[PDB]
User: What shape does this take?
Amino acid sequence: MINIQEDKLVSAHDAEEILRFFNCHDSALQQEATTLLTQEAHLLDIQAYRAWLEHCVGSEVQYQVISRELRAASERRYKLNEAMNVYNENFQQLKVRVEHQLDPQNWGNSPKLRFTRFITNVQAAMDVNDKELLHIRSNVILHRARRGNQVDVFYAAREDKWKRGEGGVRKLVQRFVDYPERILQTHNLMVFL
Amino acid sequence: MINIQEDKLVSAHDAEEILRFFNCHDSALQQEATTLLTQEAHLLDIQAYRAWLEHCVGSEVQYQVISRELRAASERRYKLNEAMNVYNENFQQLKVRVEHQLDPQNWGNSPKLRFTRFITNVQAAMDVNDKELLHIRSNVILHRARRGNQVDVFYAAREDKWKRGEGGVRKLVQRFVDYPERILQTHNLMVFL
Amino acid sequence: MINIQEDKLVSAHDAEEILRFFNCHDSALQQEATTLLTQEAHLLDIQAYRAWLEHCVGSEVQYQVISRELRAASERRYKLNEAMNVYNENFQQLKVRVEHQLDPQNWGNSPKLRFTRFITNVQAAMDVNDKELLHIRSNVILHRARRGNQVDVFYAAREDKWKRGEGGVRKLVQRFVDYPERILQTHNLMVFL
Amino acid sequence: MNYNNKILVSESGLSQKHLIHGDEELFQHELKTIFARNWLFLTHDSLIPAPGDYVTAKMGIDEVIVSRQNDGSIRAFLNVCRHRGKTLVSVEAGNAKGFVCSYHGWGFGSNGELQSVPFEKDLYGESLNKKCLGLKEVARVESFHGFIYGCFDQEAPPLMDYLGDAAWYLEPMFKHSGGLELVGPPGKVVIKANWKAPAENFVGDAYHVGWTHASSLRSGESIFSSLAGNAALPPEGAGLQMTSKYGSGMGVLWDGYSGVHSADLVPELMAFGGAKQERLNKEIGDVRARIYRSHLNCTVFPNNSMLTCSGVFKVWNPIDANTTEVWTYAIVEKDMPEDLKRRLADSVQRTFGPAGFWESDDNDNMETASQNGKKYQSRDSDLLSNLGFGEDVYGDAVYPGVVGKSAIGETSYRGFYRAYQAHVSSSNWAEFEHASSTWHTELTKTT
Amino acid sequence: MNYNNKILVSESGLSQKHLIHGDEELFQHELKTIFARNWLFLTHDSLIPAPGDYVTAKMGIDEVIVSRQNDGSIRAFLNVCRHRGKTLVSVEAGNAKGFVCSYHGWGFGSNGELQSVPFEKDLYGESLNKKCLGLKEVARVESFHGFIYGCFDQEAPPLMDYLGDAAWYLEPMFKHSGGLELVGPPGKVVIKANWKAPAENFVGDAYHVGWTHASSLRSGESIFSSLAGNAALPPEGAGLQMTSKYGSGMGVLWDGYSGVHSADLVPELMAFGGAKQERLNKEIGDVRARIYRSHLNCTVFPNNSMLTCSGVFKVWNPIDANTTEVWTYAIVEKDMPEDLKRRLADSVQRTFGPAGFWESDDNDNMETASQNGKKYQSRDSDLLSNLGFGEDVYGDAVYPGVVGKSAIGETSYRGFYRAYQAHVSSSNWAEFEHASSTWHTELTKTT
Amino acid sequence: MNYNNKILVSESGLSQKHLIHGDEELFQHELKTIFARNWLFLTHDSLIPAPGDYVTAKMGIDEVIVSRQNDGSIRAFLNVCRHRGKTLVSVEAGNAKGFVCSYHGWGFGSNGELQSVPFEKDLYGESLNKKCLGLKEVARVESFHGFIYGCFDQEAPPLMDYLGDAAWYLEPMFKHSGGLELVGPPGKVVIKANWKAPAENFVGDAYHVGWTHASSLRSGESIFSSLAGNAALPPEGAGLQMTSKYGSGMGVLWDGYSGVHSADLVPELMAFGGAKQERLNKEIGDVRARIYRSHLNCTVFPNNSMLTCSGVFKVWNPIDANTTEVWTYAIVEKDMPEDLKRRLADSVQRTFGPAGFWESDDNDNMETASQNGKKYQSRDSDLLSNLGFGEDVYGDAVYPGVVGKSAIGETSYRGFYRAYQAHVSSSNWAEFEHASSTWHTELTKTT
Ligand SMILES: c1ccc2[nH]ccc2c1
Ligand SMILES: c1ccc2[nH]ccc2c1
Ligand SMILES: c1ccc2[nH]ccc2c1
Ligand code: FES
Ligand code: FES
Ligand code: FES
Ligand SMILES: [Fe+3]
Ligand SMILES: [Fe+3]
Ligand SMILES: [Fe+3]
Assistant: This one.
C-alpha cells in the first residue's frame, strides 16, 4: 500500500498499522470487536470502574496516553525526549486510579459526573505471532459534564491489543493513544480513553 | 457482573441495564437495531417529522427526556422531586410538536435549520416477558446549525423499547434519556433525541 | 414513504434519497460499505493523501462540497445562484490539493497537524441502472488539532457513489456534501470530508 | 457614562436607549444599583420544608445558600468560604446541619457560623476570631405566601411594600386559593439575551402573543388560540394592564385559567378554577374571585416573572449584557389533586421549559433585540413603549396601581423602565424614593 | 488613549504601532471614525436586479437590508425593527415587497416605510406617527459600474471622488470591458485576525507571494508560479504600486490575466483577455488596454479587496480586534461565455474561498500578526512599511496617484495607513481633509 | 483603580482583596508590574544543551525563543518578526542556526540578528538598517544551577539575589546533589483559575493536603498518607515555612524524600536520598544534608513552583484573570540511574500532570476561588492568611529568612503577597526597594 518516501506526511508507525488491517479481512472479528468495545464503553460510562478492571483489563496491561512535543516537520538534529506520558499505567496503577475515583472523600465526584462515550471506526486483526492476541483500532469521542455548566469533549484514536482470556472474557493488554491536542482545553485529562 | 455495593458510583438502574445486554448476544439483532436507528435518524435529519411519526413511533409511546437536580453523592435525607421532564410525551403530544415544526408561521424555521445526527454504541436485547418488545440502547451526537453562525451540539445516551409492529415496521414505544448537562448551553433542547 | 406535500420541510432531493435506502436491504453490503469508509478515513487521518488518491479515488471523480445561501422557507421568486462550491474537484484538482499538502514549503503543515475522523450512520444501496455503482451515505465528524491550542470540529452528511473497480478496489466516483454551517467557525474548510 | 445624568429611559418611560440591552459597563452598574438593591427570588417553602434543607440560588451574579433553620426561619449566605474563598456547596439542593469546605476543611453551620476548623487548637490556638468569620449573610429574607425573596440592602422597603399595587392582583391566587407550591427542580438554560428582554416581555407584552406564538397557538389548541396569526384580537374588555411604584407589573386576561395548556388539560382546569372561584365569591368578592382564575403575566421587579393559571415561574439570572441563565419552575395550587399537579408541571415544562415550544418562539426575538443593542448604529436608537400612553389611570375605585383598561398595551413596560431609571441614576434607596415621589403622575401624564 | 495626539502611524506611513491590530478600545473607535465615516461594499446589481430583490450585508458591525426599489434605485436600511429592536430579516437574499417583524408583526415596505401595524386602529388609534417610524436609512448609496457601496455619513465625498486616483486603474476592467458581474453567493468564514491584516495584504503586498504561497504556486502551476519559494523575482518593470488620498491602493502585475488560476484555465483566459485587449487598444489606448488585462491586487479603503483577472472579490467584515468574517465572491466579465463564467467562479473559490488553498497559506500570517498586537512586549513595537520609500512619485504623466514604479514594494501600505491616521485622529470629514491637504507630499518626501 | 493607593493586600500580608483573583484591569496591570519586572522561568540546560538548540517559552503573555549560542551562552528573543509582526517559530523545540519568517521570508540568526532579507539588493538596495532590526531581546538571562530564567527589566536584581533567603534551602538539592535535570517535554493544560491561586497553593499551603488530597493520599499509599482526611496532623517539628524579600517562599517537610510517590517507588527513593544524604553530611553539614532529602514545596516568585523530592516542576502561565496555562515538567537528580529517572518522570506526570490524580483534587479549589473574585458581593471581601502570625521569626541562627517553625501555617502566603503589594504599587525596581526596606519587620510584627 503506502510508501512513506512518497507519502511524505506519513510516519513509519502509521504505515505499519494500515498494513495490518488492509490485508486479511475477517468480518466476524470486526463485529466481535465492535461488541467488546461497546460493552467496555458502557461499563465506563456508568462509572463501573471496578467491573471494568475485573471484566475488561488484563493483569499484564500497559495503558498509555502520550503528548508529543511540537517539532518542525523538517527537524532531524534535536534528539531529546519526544513525548511524555499522560498515562503509562500497569494494572496496579489503574487500580490506584479506580480507588481514587471511588473514595467518598473524592470531593470532585460530588455531584456525580456524567459520561457519554461514542466509539467508531472499529478495525480488528489477529496478531501474526501470538494467537492469543487481537489488534483492535477504534476512535472515541468522550463527553464529560459536571457541575451544571462544565462540559469537556475528548477526541482520540486508540491502538489496542486484547487477549482472548478465559471463558470468552477478552481483556485489554495494551492501549496506546497519541493525544491529538498538545495543550488540553478540558481542565485535565482525568478520563479513561 | 456488577455489584453496586462495591462499585460505589453505579446506580441500581444502570447496573440492571448492563445485565440486560451482557447476557445473550444475538449478532443479527444488533445489526437489525443498527439499521432501524440509522433509518430513524435519517428521517429526523431531513426533517421528515410526519414520516417519522408514521413509520417509527408507536401509538403507545412515552418519549421522555429528564434533567436531574445536582445532589450530594452522600445525600440520603432530602426526598423531593429528583428530576424534571424536559420531554414526557405521548403520541398526541409528539404530534402537536410536529405540527408546530411544520407550521409556516413557525418563524424560527426560516431559514431552514440543518440537522446531522451520529448514532453509535448500539446494543439490543429482547424483552424477557413481552416477545413483541426489543430493548435498544444507543448514544447520539446531534448537531444543529442555523442562522449563519448558531451551532448547538447535543450528546446523550438513549434507552429505548421498540415493538415489532406489523409488516416489519418496528415502532418506538418508549425512549428514555437522562440528559447529561444540567444547565443547557444550546439555547434550548427543542430537538428530537 | 414520504410525501413532501405533507412533510412540508422535506426537499425533493432528500425524499429521493430516503426512498433509495429504505427499499432493498442488503446487510452484507452495509458491512462492506462500513469497512470501505473506515479504511478511507484511516488513510486520511494519517495524512496518506497519495495513497488515498491511488487506492480510494476514481479517475472520473467529482468531489463536491457546497454552501447554500440562507433563503426564506417561503421564497419562490428569487432565482439566482443558490449555492457555491467550497469544493467541486475532478481528479486532477484533487491531485493539486494533495501536492500542496505534501510540499515541504507548506509552512502551515509544520508542526504536523493531527486528524481524527468518526464515520457513522452508514447506508448502502446498489444503483438501479449501473451495476458498477454503489450509493453510500454516511455522516462524518472530523477533528483537526494544530499548533497547541487550535481545535476545529467539522460535521456533515456525505452522499457518495463508489464504483466496484478492479481487484476488489472500490473507488469513489462522486462525493456530495451540503455543508450545514453557512458561516464557518473553523478558520477554513481545508479538510477532506 | 455618567449614570446620574444620562437619559437611558425617556420621561414617562416612553422609550429606552437600545444600548441598555448590550452595554457591559451598564450591566456592571446594574449589579450595584439593581441586583444589590432590590428583592430577588430565592426559593419556595415547598422546596426547603424541613430543618436542614437547603438549596443554592443566584442573586444577580452571586450564588447563595438558602437554608431552613431549626427555629423554622430561613437564612441565606454567600456560597463562598471565609478563608480563601472557594465555593462551599457544589450541589443544588440537599439536607445538612452544616457545610464543610473541600479546600482546608473549615466547617460552617446551617446558620452561617464558623463551627470548626481542622486542628484549630494546634494551629490557631486561641487566636482565631470564629465569631467574625461566619459566612457573609444576605441582609434581608422575607416570604410572600411561601415564596422566599432576598435582598442584600438593609435599606430596602419590606417585600410586601415593594410589591406595591401588584400585590392586590397576586393575592387571590397566592393567598386566597389556599396556597401554591413550587414544583422543582427547575429547568435551566442559557440564552444569549439580556435579562431585561424576557423581563419586559413577561411584565407587559400581550401584543406579541398572536404573532410570535402563532404556530404554538395553532398547534396546541389552548384557550388563547383564537389569536393565532393575529387572526383576531380580543374584546377591549378582555383584560387590563397594571404597573406599580417599585417596577412590578402585570397583564390580566380575564377568565383564562387554563392559560397556555393544550386542550388535553383545558377541561379539568376550567372546572377546577371555576369551582374554587364560586367559593371565593363569598370570601373576597366577585372581582377578586375572578382575578384568581384570570391569567396574570407578571414580572416582580427586576427579574422574576410568572404566568398564573398557566403555572409558569421564571428567574432571569444575569450573566452578562447578552447572556442570561433561565430557570423554569411550575407553580401549582396545593389543594389540586396529585395527578393533576403532576400533569400541570409537565405541561409547564412542555410549553415553557428547556424544550418548551412556546418559549422557543420567543428565543430569536429576545436574543436579536439584545444583541442589536451592541451594534454601533443602534446604541443610541430608541426602543418604543408608547402604546396606550395617555389613557392610563391611577387610583381607580376597583383596580389599583397605574392601570390601562385594555388587554394589550405598554403600560407595564413604562412602569418597569421608570423604576429602572430611578434606580440606575440613584446611589441608594432614599434617592430612589426622591426620584419616585411623583411616579404615577409621570406615568399618566396626558390623561 | 487620546486619538487626537497618539502617533499610531508614523510620518509618511513608514511604520505603525503593533497595538493597532489588537487594541479593543481602538476597534471601538474605528467603528466611529472608519466604518461609520467611509464607503463600504454592499452588493452588486447582478445580485439584486429586479424590483423587490434584496440582500443583507454588513456595514462595520451593523447589518443592513439592501433593496431594489420599484423605480430602479437601491436603498439600504438597518436590519432592526423600529419598535423594540428585533432583527427584521433572517435570510441573506430574497424577493419581497416588504418585511414583517416576527415579534409584534410590524410591517415595513422595501422602501423602509412603516406600512402596517397589527390592530393599529384598535390599539394606537391615530396616535402612531408612522411617518417618523421608517427603518433607519443608510444616508448614501452609490454605484461604481454595478458595484454598490454605502456610507452612513452624509458628509462623505462622492464614491467616485473617494476612489481618487485608484479609479483610473479599475476603469479598464470595470467599465471598458463591457462590465462585470458578481457571482454569488459568497463563501463566509471567520478568521482570528484584525480586519486590517488582510486589507493591507491585498492593498500592497506582492513581497509575500513567492514565500507565503510557495506551495500553492508550485502545486497549481499558475502563471505567477516562477516565484515559488523566491526561486526568482520579476523584472523591475513587471509592475507598479499605487495609492491615493482616501486610502485605496493597488499593485499592478503587467499582463497577468489568468492570475492565480491553475493551468487548466490559463490558455482560455489568456486568449479571452488578449482578444479584448486588442479591441480596447483603439478605444482607450494601449496603456489602459494593457491595464485591463493586468492583475490588480487592490483594497478599496477600508475593507473591500479584490484581485482583478483572478476574479477574487473580498469583504473583511470586522467583528472585534482579533476577529473578522471573510466574504468571498467571484467577479466575471459579463460577456464571457457562460461555461467559462462557471469555471472561473469555481476556481476563485478553489484558490481563495473557504477551502481555498492559496487563502490557507495566508491564515497563520494574518492571525498571528494580529494576535501578537495584544501581547504586552509588542504593543508599542513598530510594524515596518518602508520598502521603496523615497522612490515614489506623484503626478506622473502616464500613471496617476502616488506611484512606485516597481512590482514589489510598500507604497500602498503607506497610503493606506496615512489615510487611517488621518481618520482615527479626526472627528469628521472636514478634519480629515485638513489633515490630508499635503497627503502626496508626505508620501513622496525624500525623493 | 489607583494602584498607588489601593490597599489590595493589608499590612503584614494578613489578608488580600478577593478581586485580585478576578479583576481584568489588575491582570493588565500585573503584566507591567509583575511579569515585565520580575524573573520568569524559561528552560533548563538539559533541554537545550547543544549549540543551535532552542525552545519556545512564555514570559507572562509574551512568547520568546530561548536559544543556545555557539559560545555556550543562552539568549532569548520575542517570537515576533521585526517586519510585520508574524510569529516566527511555530514549534516548541528544535535545533537550527536561524529562523525564517513564513510571511515574507526574513531570516534571523540564533543570535537574534537580521541576517537575510529576500531580494534585499533589488528591493531595499542599501537602505535597510539590518543592524537595528534584530529580534527584540530579553534584557536579562541568568542560570540557577542549570535552571534558566529571564527578565525583561535591566534594573532587576541578579537572579541569585532575587532568590534571597530561599536560595539557601534550594542549594542542597540544586547544587550539592550533583545537579538536576529537567525531563521534558512538559504537560500543558489550561485551567480556569488565576495564576496566583496555584502559585499561593504551592508557596505555602500544607494545610490543604490532608483534606483536599484525602482520596489521593488514601489511594496512592505515599509517605505523606497518614494525613488522609485529616486523620492526623504531624509533629509541630515535622517541618517549617519560610519566605523572603522578593516574594519567593517554601514549606519544608523533614525527610519526605519520596514525596507524593505511590508506594511502588518509596523504597528505592528513600534508599537513594538517604545514601546521598550520608555523603553530604561531611560536605555541607547535617542540617543542610537533611534539607537535601526533605520535601520542599516552593514558589519562585511570581509563577514558578516546584516540589523537590517529588520532582514536580510547574509554570503557571497567565492568560487572563481566570485563565492559566499550566506547564508540568519532572525534575530528576542527574546521577540517578536511568531507569529510576524514567519511572520518577512518569510518576510526576501520574500525580501532577495533565491526568494527575493529585492535581485533579486541586482543580475546583483553584478555579472556584478565582472565579468568585469576579462576583459582586465578594470583590471587596478579604481572603485570610493570618495562620501563624506573630510567631514568625527572622535572622534565625540556623534557618534563614522569615521563618515559621511549624509545618503548617501561612507565613509563605504573607511574604508572597507582601512582595506582590510592593510591586503593584511601584513604578520601578527602586520604588519596590523603597517599599520593602522593612519587609521582615512587617512580616514578624507582633512577635
Ligand atoms: C400569555 C399572555 C400574556 C403574556 N405575556 C408574556 C407571556 C404571556 C403569555
Ligand atoms: C497576487 C498578486 C499580488 C497580491 N497581493 C495579495 C494577493 C495577491 C495575489
Ligand atoms: C506536598 C506538601 C506541601 C504542598 N503544598 C502544595 C503541594 C504540596 C505537596
Ligand atoms: S478556602 Fe475554605 S477552608 Fe480554606
Ligand atoms: S420588535 Fe418588531 S414589531 Fe415589535
Ligand atoms: S512579517 Fe516576517 S518577513 Fe514580513
Ligand atoms: Fe411569549
Ligand atoms: Fe496571499
Ligand atoms: Fe495540592
Q: What stands out?
A: The pocket of FE2/S2 (inorganic) cluster (ligand 5) is lined by residues E 81, 83-84, 86, 101, 103-106 (CB under 6 Å). DSSP finds 14 helices and 21 strands in chain E.
